[PDB]
Structure 1
Amino acid sequence: IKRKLRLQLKKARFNASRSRSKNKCFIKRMENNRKIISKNNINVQVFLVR
């Protein structure tokens, strides 16, 4: 099988193998962060997670 195609295919399969549950957790976190940022003049605690 040709190397160009198999590299494309392997990369596409890795990309597509993401879990919707994890995506939903990330979406929930993003929504929470945007809601907090929408505020103004409050003390906020920032954790680094990535």
Structure 2
Amino acid sequence: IKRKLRLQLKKARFNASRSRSKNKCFIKRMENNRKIISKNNINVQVFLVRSLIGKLNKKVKVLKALGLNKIGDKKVHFLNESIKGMLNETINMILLSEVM
């Protein structure tokens, strides 16, 4: 079987083998994050949940500017426009909880 085709096929199968349950969990997390970011002037706790390896250079810079270097990083920040923009940039790699 030709190598061009088998490489395309192997890649397509790996991509398509994602679980809808995991996708639903991710969607729920994204909705929660957007709901929190929609607020204004609250103290929010930011957890880093996805690694920095392999991500874009710009986004690694944004995360290091937020103060998160590892998974399991905990930082409290006051939501203003700057922090809101940074969180929007890196929404897919963070978990936002709110500090009552």
Q: TM-score, normalised by structure 2?
A: 0.50
Structure 1: segments with no counterpart, 5+ residues: none
Deviations 1:1-48 (A, max 9, x none): 000000000000000000000000000000000000000000000000
**Separation in 2, partners of 1:34, 1:10:** 35
RMSD between aligned residues: 0.0
Higher relative contact order (CA 8 A, sep 6+): 2
Q: Secondary structure at the match of 1:47?
A: strand
Larger CA Rg, structure 1 vs 2? 1
How many aligned positions are there?
Answer: 50
**Separation in 2, partners of 1:40, 1:14:** 41
Task: Tell me which protein shows more helix as a share of its residues.
Answer: 1
Task: Tell me which protein shows more strand as a share of its residues.
Answer: 2
Percent of aligned pairs with the same residue? Answer: 100
Runs of 4+ in structure 1 deviating by more than 2 angstroms, as ranges, are: none
